[PDB]
Amino acid sequence: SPKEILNLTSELLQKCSSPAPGKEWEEYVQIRTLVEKIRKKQKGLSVTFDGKREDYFPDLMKWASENGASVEGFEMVNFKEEGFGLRATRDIKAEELFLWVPRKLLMTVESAKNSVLGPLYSQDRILQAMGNIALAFHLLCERASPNSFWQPYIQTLPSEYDTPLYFEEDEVRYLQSTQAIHDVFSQYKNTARQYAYFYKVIQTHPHANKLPLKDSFTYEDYRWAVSSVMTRQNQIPTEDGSRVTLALIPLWDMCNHTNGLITTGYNLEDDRCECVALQDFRAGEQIYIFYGTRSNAEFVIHSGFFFDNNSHDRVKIKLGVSKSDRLYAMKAEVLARAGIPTSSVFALHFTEPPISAQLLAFLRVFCMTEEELKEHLLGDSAIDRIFTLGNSEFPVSWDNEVKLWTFLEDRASLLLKTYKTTIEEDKSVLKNHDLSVRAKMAIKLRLGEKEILEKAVKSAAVNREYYRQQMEEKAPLPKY
C-alpha cells in the first residue's frame, strides 16, 4: 500500500531528523528496525537487469570505444579478493599512459543538471548543495531510463556493496566502543533521513513528475545509489577549469586499489581522465591504481573494504586548550598566530612520526610555560619561533618536549583503555572464528584503531626518553 509506505517514511524522516542522542547504539538499532520494516515491504531495486553483470561488459567496451576511450590491453576479471577488476592482456610498463576516458562518458553534477533530474535539481536545496547526493539521483534516474546514454555503464555496476549500510546488526556490533562506529551511525542515519526526505519530495514536487522514481523509489534504490557514488566518485575540474565538480568515471573506475601514489589525472586540454601505470603489469596481472591516502575507517565506511597494511592509516584525537588553563589567552593567541585553532580533531598516524607538524605545534603550545609563550608573542624573534613550531628539529625547550611526549603517551594509553576488547582478543577472534567479509572488516578496523594507539604509545615513550636524556645531559638547544 502506498499509504503505509508514506506513513513509514514520515516516521523515518521524523526519527532521523532529531538531534544526536550513550544513546547512539540504541538510536541506531531503532533506525535499523524502521528501515528494515520498510525494506521488507518493498521490492528491492526498482530496476534489475536480465543478464549477469559480466554479460554487459562488451557493451561497456563498445560504448567507451566509440566515445574515444582506451579499450585495448586489458580485460575484465572477477577476482575473489577485490571483486571485478582490470587484468593486463599485454605487458604494461610503469608510467605508460594506458587508460583514458573522455569527459563525454562521465556522469557529473553538470550532466545531472541537464538530465530529466534537471527541474527537481533547480528547486531542491539539498540537491543544489550536495553534488554527491545529486550524482546518486542522477544514477538512479538514468538507471531507470532504458535509453539512457549511460546504460552500458550502469548495467556493469555492482548490485550490492560492503559499505556498512549493508552490514547486519551483529556485524556493526563488533565496532562498539570504537571511533569508527560513530561514523557508521551517522552514515546510516544520514542515508535513512535522505531516503525518507526525497521519497516525500518526489511525491509532492511537480518537478519530479517525469522522473521514473515517481512510480518506484525504494530504500534499496537509495542505498545502492549512494553506495555506488561513495565507493566510486571523483573530483575533477569543470570544462572551463574554473571549478571542481564530482564525477563517476566509467571503465577506469573498475581498477582496484593497491599501495602507491596517485597516477590518474585530468587532462584539461584534451578533456579526458588519463591513467599511467602505477607499476609494471605483466600480461595476466591485475591492473591496480592507488585510490588516495585514506584511512581504513574511510576505506571501510566510504569504499566498502579494509586494506591490509594501509600505510596511511590513522585515528582521530580531539585536543584543545581549556578555558580553565591559567595561560589560556596566551596559548590561544600563539595558536592563532600559528594558524591553529584552540580546539580541534587531530590525527594519530600509523607510520612514524605518529603526529603531524600541526599536531606537534599544538602540543608544544599546549605544554608551554608562561615565559616560553612570551617568547612566541613578543619581540623581534617571536615570528621566527612561530615558524618553527611544527618542526621537530627545533624544540622550544627540552622540558617542553618531555612534557608533550609524556602527555601524548598518557593520552594514547588512556584511549587504549576505552575499547571493549584488547588487541590480543581481536587477533584471537580473527584466528579462531570463521567470519564473513563484512564481519572481518569490522574486527580488523577495531583492531587497527588499537594498534595505531599502541604504536603511538611506544613512539611517545621513546621520544620522552630521548628528550629527557638531552635534558639531563644539558644538551645545547638547536638554534634556527
Binding site: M130, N234, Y266
Partner: peptide, 17 residues
Amino acid sequence: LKYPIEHGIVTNWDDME
C-alpha cells in the same frame, strides 16, 4: 599531476551540517 583524480574521494554526506 595538475588535477590528480582520487578514486572514491570522501565527501560530506551530512545534509544537516
